[PDB]
């Protein structure tokens, strides 16, 4: 990993010295740098050994001498394919932008502000202080991606009181991170694993992490930032948001909640149970109220992510496997649906949803692919999302199956409204006022669709290569939770 | 059963959107709450100029 780690930063910076009004070169070379960092992510996958509690390719550089809070970079188990999904998806955003001129949307600026692999950092960052810096850090890139080239639906903004609470929750986690950091000098995640805290304080520290996380996670009391953040997000800002920025909260719980505070997690199991359950119920019923397509997909994403939560709780190896594989399948499916709804916007240039009609005439291949992914967002058994969600379900393994009975409503209403909305979008010869402008999909368009469908099917028919490469790590996490 | 679903959908809209408005109204009120306390204390502070 030593050299092949910093591909996106090197690429971005050495392209910053190429303003190059003639876009062809910046597009080509940024895309090549992204694709080669993805290639090195994938060869790093191939490099994996599914047999160690240690982290696969550890590296560091002194960051502050005393207590050495340094860039500790591990990729065991989950992070392995989290960074893989990150890379998998970043060329997708670079490729959804072969727009010809791309002038006001200055192409090199979006290249340089999507080609920041701080997501790679955080998923490999294995000392929760610097790990803290990155999800909060990616907000500066996310904010510029969300509105600079993002569609303007309102005076671009986020609920100000909610945003203040969201960042306050993030900084509340920071106080908890410091309390553990000075609690026993424990710099990094290996030693924060080894150490043992006061049960009276483990619960406080757990909920303090949980503040920021359950903001990043879309739980019922605070999740509103996803719809408002997406309906304004650009086509490639949503692909990243759904893809990774939601995985942030669940991976945070996975690494720095379950094997960190085993007693606090034991104590708060019913809390997250009910939270995620009622969140899934709400976000299943809501798309009744929401007619906005981006809000629809964002709420389906909330549902899936709170399923990821209702599964990560468990010492069930199947439980957390279903959690992380619902994460992978979600970063595939919701991002593929955001790709879909972005194509559906642009090809129609309209931001009402009642206006997407006669799709089987305009773009019938888009109808086929939109089904190929909406069956997934409802988790058709056979798809990747099915393996994910059902290992989430069997996560009631040592349990007594009372939260699966709330996932009942959460997923039945989800699949129901998934089908309702796929109909509502493709229904009828509802002639729109587009002046016979059909907008058939592009070869590059079906290309950027290719990898999501491929990952989806390759998981849904063969989840081994992902459950393997993971079981050793998750099982170590579980025994530390034992 | 369909009478049940209609009455239950109406009640569901009621409960959920009611608590939604409850949240939002609590936020709206609790803003100017601190605003006006802070301004009253600052008003004492600026009457210190000419007490």
């Amino acid at each position: 990993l030593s050299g092949l780690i910093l591909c996106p930063v090197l690429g971005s910076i050495i392209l910053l010295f190429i303003p190059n009004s003639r876009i062809r070169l910046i597009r080509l070379i940024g895309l090549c740098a992204s694709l080669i960092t993805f290639l090195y992510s994938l060869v790093l996958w191939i490099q994996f050994d599914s047999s160690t509690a240690k982290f696969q390719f550890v590296e560091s550089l002194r960051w502050l001498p005393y207590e050495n809070i340094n860039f500790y970079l591990g990729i065991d188990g989950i992070s392995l394919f989290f960074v893989i999904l990150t890379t998998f998806l970043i060329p997708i955003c670079i490729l959804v932008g072969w727009s010809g001129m791309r002038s006001y949307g200055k192409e090199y600026i979006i290249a340089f502000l999507i080609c920041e692999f701080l997501m790679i950092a955080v998923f490999c960052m294995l000392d929760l202080l610097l790990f803290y810096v990155f999800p909060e850090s990616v907000l500066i890139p996310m904010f510029i991606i969300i509105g600079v080239w993002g569609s303007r639906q309102r005076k671009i903004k986020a609920a100000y009181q909610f945003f203040l609470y969201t960042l306050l929750g993030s900084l509340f986690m920071l106080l908890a991170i410091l309390l553990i950091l000075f609690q026993t000098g424990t710099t990094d995640l290996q030693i924060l694993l080894t150490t043992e805290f006061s049960e009276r304080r483990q619960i406080f520290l757990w909920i303090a992490f949980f503040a920021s996380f359950a903001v990043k996670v879309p739980m019922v009391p605070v999740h509103i930032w996803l719809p408002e953040a997406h309906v304004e997000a650009p086509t490639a800002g949503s692909v990243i948001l759904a893809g990774i920025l939601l995985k942030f909260g669940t991976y945070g719980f996975l690494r720095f909640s379950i094997p960190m505070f085993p007693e606090a997690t034991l104590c708060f199991t019913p809390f997250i149970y009910t939270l995620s359950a009622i969140a899934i119920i709400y976000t299943s019923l809501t798309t009744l109220r929401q007619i906005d397509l981006k809000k629809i997909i964002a709420y389906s994403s909330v549902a899936h992510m709170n399923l990821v939560t209702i599964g990560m709780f468990s010492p069930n190896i199947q439980g957390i496997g279903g959690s992380i594989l619902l994460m992978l399948s979600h970063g595939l499916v919701s991002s593929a649906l955001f790709l879909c709804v972005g194509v559906l916007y642009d090809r129609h240039k309209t931001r009402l949803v009642r206006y997407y009609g006669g799709l089987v005439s305009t773009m019938p291949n888009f109808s086929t692919i939109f089904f190929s992914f909406t069956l997934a967002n409802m988790s058709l058994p056979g798809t990747s999302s099915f393996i994910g969600e059902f290992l989430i379900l069997v996560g009631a393994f040592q349990r007594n199956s009372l939260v699966a009975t709330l996932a009942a409503l959460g997923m039945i209403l989800g699949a129901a409204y998934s089908l309702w909305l796929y109909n509502r979008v493709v229904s009828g010869n509802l002639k729109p006022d587009f002046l016979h402008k059909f907008s058939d999909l592009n070869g590059r368009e079906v290309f950027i669709f290719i990898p999501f469908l491929v990952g989806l099917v390759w998981m849904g028919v063969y989840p081994k290569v992902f459950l393997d490469c993971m079981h050793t790590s998750v099982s170590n996490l579980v025994q530390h939770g034992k | 059963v369909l009478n049940d679903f209609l009455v239950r959908s109406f009640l569901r809209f009621g409960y959920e959107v009611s608590f939604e408005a409850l949240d939002k109204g609590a936020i709206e009120i609790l803003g100017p709450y601190g605003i006006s306390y802070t301004f009253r204390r600052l008003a004492e502070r600026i009457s210190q100029l000419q007490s």
């Binding site: 019913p270 149970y273 009622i278 119920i281 009372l402 939260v403 | 009611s18 608590f19």
Partner: peptide
Amino acid sequence: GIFGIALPIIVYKGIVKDFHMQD
């Protein structure tokens, strides 16, 4: 109703607790 689900959710939690008391 929303507060009803909020309290019945922790009631299902308590049901898990009663199952824990079953053994």
